[PDB]
Design a protein around this ligand. Structure first.
Ligand SMILES: Cc1cc2nc3c(=O)[nH]c(=O)nc-3n(C[C@H](O)[C@H](O)[C@H](O)COP(=O)(O)OP(=O)(O)OC[C@H]3O[C@@H](n4cnc5c(N)ncnc54)[C@H](O)[C@@H]3O)c2cc1C
Length: 494
């Protein structure tokens, strides 16, 4: 099934692994690439968003097939289920069965993963804000350029709701309580969204791979392919061990470059199982503390055009990221729509930047194996005093914003359990030097293994509140360009 050797082997098929495939297809066109995804193909073109599947029954099946071992488990698909705090995953995702919490620690009880072609971007709500202040990685002089390139790969736009009736009204009402003393980049503005188009549809990994990857004769995608090991020969990346889930057969695929984009929890898991264990691996894990709310606007009368998505930017002084959105553009069900006046109800979400700690980590136990046969995950996570103060300010701020747009549907703001944001950073984080605090270089290349590159939210080292996918793709673009420059300028061959 698999080639004996390739130039680049890519683990996973989410937007960050898809970014490597795209830039390598554009900038190193002759290079052979094999992408391996453990989950099945659930959409067309491969990795497309499940919400673009018109048939609801076929859409439910695509979501169920994405839930790995939690396929036959009850999910959270209503605002009542979110507020009930039941330890369930949202459709298209699955939770850990054990090792999510430990005594004297908060853990991440609702830490979720997706197993399908396209990763979580086959199920996401495409908010693509830019980082600001201390969120920006300071040692990347080209950060702005890479963020603009990430906008290109995701097809990001801030004008999809320029025809929506309530988008300008929500924006101007939030601006009255947010904008005072802020420079233009930190004022209330439309959220940049990864939305395609024939009505406005969500963008998945299919948009990031694009026609450049799909028309590349040298690229091949293998679904139902579990990468169990990253192979190392002479201290450099040598290939991948891959279990063909359609037969149980385990193969070895040789490669000059190995790119792991397997999400923030499974990327350090695969490195740990391969014997690639630097001291910073899986440490400085950070979730974005999340608070939710809902509000009804004060007026009369697949993706709908109601009020769009408003962005309340993070600042160092007010370290949370806000998003005010129409109910179908929310990462979590927040309210039912108003029957008489539709589009008049908006959801509110605040996400907190974390107080980075070395002891917040994802650890692995070789004595216990998970549903895929890999070392089980142990999550050690705890909110500090500073984290609780910031989360308290976020609960106050979300009420201020909710009252500013209208009449709040709920009396109190609701904090979601740790893991709810689905934005886990820092587990394979980049740094300037190999001091024992970072796993990879500014080009996302693992310090310990030349040729081995990491991808995803785990790469982000800073304390961020904003939705991470756009930044993670921007970092993937820099890593993929280092690979393309090395391949195109090498005297060596395949
Ligand atoms: C409901 C929802 C709403 C969201 N909304 C937003 C939003 O508005 N904005 C935002 O920025 N983020 C949002 N997210 C999060 C976003 O989807 C992720 O940040 C993003 O998908 C991460 O990209 P990734 O490529 O690093 O990893 P993933 O998307 O998680 O993909 C990793 C892939 O690797 C595969 N894989 C893992 N281990 C192996 C292995 N050993 N072998 C082979 N394959 C493997 C997995 O099956 C998976 O498909 C949302 C997510 C959900 C589900």
């Amino acid at each position: 099934r698999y080639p004996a050797a390739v130039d680049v082997a890519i683990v996973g098929s989410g937007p960050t692994a898809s970014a490597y495939a795209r830039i390598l297809s554009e900038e190193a066109p002759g290079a052979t690439i094999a992408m391996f995804e453990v989950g099945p193909t659930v959409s067309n073109p491969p990795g497309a968003h499940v919400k673009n599947i018109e048939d609801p029954d076929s859409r439910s099946l695509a979501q169920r097939a994405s839930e790995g071992p939690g396929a036959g488990a009850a999910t959270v698909n209503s605002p009542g289920a979110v507020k009930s705090g039941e330890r369930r995953a949202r459709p298209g995702t699955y939770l850990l069965q054990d090792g999510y919490a430990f005594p004297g620690e908060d853990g991440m009880p609702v830490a979720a993963m997706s197993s399908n072609v396209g990763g979580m971007a086959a199920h996401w709500t495409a908010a693509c804000p830019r980082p600001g202040g201390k969120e920006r990685i300071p040692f990347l002089p080209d950060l702005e350029e890479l963020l603009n390139d990430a906008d290109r790969l995701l097809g990001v736009t801030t004008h999809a709701f320029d025809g929506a009736p309530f988008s300008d009204l929500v924006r101007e009402r939030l601006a009255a309580v947010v904008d005072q003393g802020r420079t233009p980049a930190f004022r209330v503005q439309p959220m940049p969204l990864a939305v395609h188009r024939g009505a406005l549809v969500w963008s998945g990994s299919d948009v990031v791979m694009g026609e450049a990857t799909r028309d590349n004769p040298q690229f091949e995608l293998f679904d139902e392919s579990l990468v169990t090991r990253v192979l190392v020969e002479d201290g450099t990346a040598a290939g991948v061990e891959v279990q063909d889930r359609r037969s149980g057969d385990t193969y070895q695929v040789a490669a000059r470059y190995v790119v792991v984009g397997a999400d923030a929890l499974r990327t350090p898991q695969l490195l740990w199982a391969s014997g690639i264990r630097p001291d910073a691996l899986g440490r400085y894990l950070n979730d974005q503390a999340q608070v939710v709310f809902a509000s009804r606007l004060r007026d009369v009368q697949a993706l709908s055009e109601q009020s769009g998505v408003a962005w309340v930017p993070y600042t160092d002084e007010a370290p949370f990221h806000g998003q005010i959105m129409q109910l179908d553009a929310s990462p979590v069900p927040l309210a039912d729509d108003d029957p008489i006046v539709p589009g008049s109800i908006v959801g509110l979400g605040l996400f907190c930047a974390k107080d980075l700690q070395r002891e917040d980590r994802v650890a692995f136990d070789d004595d216990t194996r998970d549903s895929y046969g890999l070392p089980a995950m142990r999550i050690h996570y705890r909110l500090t005093e500073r984290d609780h103060v910031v989360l308290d300010r976020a609960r106050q701020e979300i009420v201020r914003l909710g009252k500013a747009v209208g009449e709040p549907l709920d009396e109190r703001p609701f904090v979601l359990p740790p893991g709810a944001s689905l934005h886990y950073q820092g587990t394979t984080r980049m740094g300037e030097t190999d001091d024992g605090e970072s796993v990879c270089s500014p080009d996302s290349q693992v310090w310990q293994v030349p040729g081995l590159f990491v991808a995803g939210n785990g790469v982000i080292p800073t304390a961020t509140a904003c939705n991470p996918t756009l930044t993670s793709v921007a970092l993937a673009v820099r890593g993929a360009r280092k690979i393309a420059e090395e391949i195109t300028s090498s005297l060596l061959m395949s």
